[PDB]
Amino acid sequence: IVGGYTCGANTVPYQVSLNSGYHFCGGSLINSQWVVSAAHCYKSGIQVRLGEDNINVVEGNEQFISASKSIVHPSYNSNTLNNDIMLIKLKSAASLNSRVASISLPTSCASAGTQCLISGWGNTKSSGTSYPDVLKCLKAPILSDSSCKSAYPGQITSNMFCAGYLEGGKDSCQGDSGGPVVCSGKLQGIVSWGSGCAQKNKPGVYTKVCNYVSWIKQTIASN
């Protein structure tokens, strides 16, 4: 997260870190057994880490649970990033508390102009590289679909939305991938892609979760 703020320990209790020997993506806990992340975060041997603040220090509230299965969206296209969403099932249910909690799926899509909360342990520099220890957060508005398409001509599908600041300076970044965009208390987006981070006229592009609720519900009902 570039140009954001320190969230505060366990104030984003649905935020997870995906670990394969090292943190590589974020994710969102949607119930005691399932995490929503980006399909471009897929790999084998994922361990899901819940209740994290400092990802490099065991502070006492963590739950580390191995993934038993990963399900990439059947129409995920890794070239265009269309349908950039995947479900990860935990091999055992998380214990839900104040520091580890699920986030609701939306019943309707979010509105242009709505301020959402984007979070992660990704790069904090728009140029250069610096990774934070503690979870970072950013308040950013959903952009109009026409400004989104204008920013990325030929690349924005109905399964994507832009959020952020056209002036630059504030954005999600590498390492935030797969993490939550929460608007009005619902998981509305997943950190997906962008041209660099916090660049002028290049806002963040996010998977439009409201399009996938049926698939999510069907998939979790059968796996």
Ligand SMILES: N=C(N)c1ccc(/C=N/OCC(=O)O)cc1
């Ligand atoms: N909002 C952005 N500008 C943005 C969003 C997501 C990414 C993700 N890159 O994937 C590689 C990785 O995470 O290691 C980059 C930039």
Ligand SMILES: [Ca+2]
């Ligand atoms: Ca920790």
